[PDB]
Amino acid sequence: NRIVKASFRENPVEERKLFPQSSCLMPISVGQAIHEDEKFAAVIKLINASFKQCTILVDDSVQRHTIGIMNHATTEELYQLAVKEGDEWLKRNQRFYKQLTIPFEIMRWDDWYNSPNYINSHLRVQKEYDTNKAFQNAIHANIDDFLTRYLSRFSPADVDHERAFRLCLDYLIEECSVMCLWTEQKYDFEVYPSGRNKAMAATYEFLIKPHHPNYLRPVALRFKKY
Numbered sequence: 001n002r003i004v005k006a007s008f009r010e011n012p013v014e015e016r017k018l019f020p021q022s023s024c025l026m027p028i029s030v031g032q033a034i035h036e037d038e039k040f041a042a043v044i045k046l047i048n049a050s051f052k053q054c055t056i057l058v059d060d061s062v063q064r065h066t067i068g069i070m071n072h073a074t075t076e077e078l079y080q081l082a083v084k085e086g087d088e089w090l091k092r093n094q095r096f097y098k099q100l101t102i103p104f105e106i107m108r109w110d111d112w113y114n115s116p117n118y119i120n121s122h123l124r125v126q127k128e129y130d131t132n133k134a135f136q137n138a139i140h141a142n143i144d145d146f147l148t149r150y151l152s153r154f155s156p157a158d159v160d161h162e163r164a165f166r167l168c169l170d171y172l173i174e175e176c177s178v179m180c181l182w183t184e185q186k187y188d189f190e191v192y193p194s195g196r197n198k199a200m201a202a203t204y205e206f207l208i209k210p211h212h213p214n215y216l217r218p219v220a221l222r223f224k225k226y
Contacts, residue, residue: 004041004042006039039193041096051102055185060082069164112178118177125177135202139173142199192219195218
């Protein structure tokens with residue numbers, strides 16, 4: 001009948017030649033459709049076919065910040081909801097990632113946030129936000145981009161815009177601080193189907209690429225029915 005196939009986007013032949021002998025990280029934005037069913041299976045199939053080894057991160061506990069924009073629950077409650085969402089993603093998509101024949105690892109957000117090196121990385125990101133205005137602007141742009149979609153189904157009247165911004169900033173600072181830590185596990189490529197968001201692209205530009213250009217090399221995918 002019909003099937004979804006996940007091809008690489010923009011990655012040159014000279015880069016793609018490296019993929020079979022390279023490692024990759026698959027950060028999972030728990031909640032997104034690109035990480036579910038037909039589109040997720042398509043990715044597992046392409047990753048299996050083209051990489052040496054793979055490790056899937058479940059970006060779960062981070063959402064405690066974003067969940068908390070409209071849900072005014074206790075900080076422990078949101079942490080729990082953010083984890084529960086990761087628990088359920090793993091249940092839902094166990095069927096697909098189990099089909100990986102290459103060596104793979106399943107990690108979760110807390111594995112990185114609780115790293116001894118997190119706090120120093122967090123300070124580094126907060127310093128760059130304060131000092132470097134290009135980086136500051138990228139983060140701010142990312143907040144606008146994210147909130148216009150996240151809060152699309154809400155009337156501006158029911159949204160605490162001060163809160164939205166604050167929590168979304170907390171989310172992006174954590175995401176970038178954890179990003180920096182990834183060089184520790186020497187991942188050659190970072191595969192996110194859509195692009196890399198503005199904040200993460202800025203963090204790679206200013207804090208990661210200058211020190212390790214052969215780590216976290218971005219990879220985006222195209223989806224098509226065949």
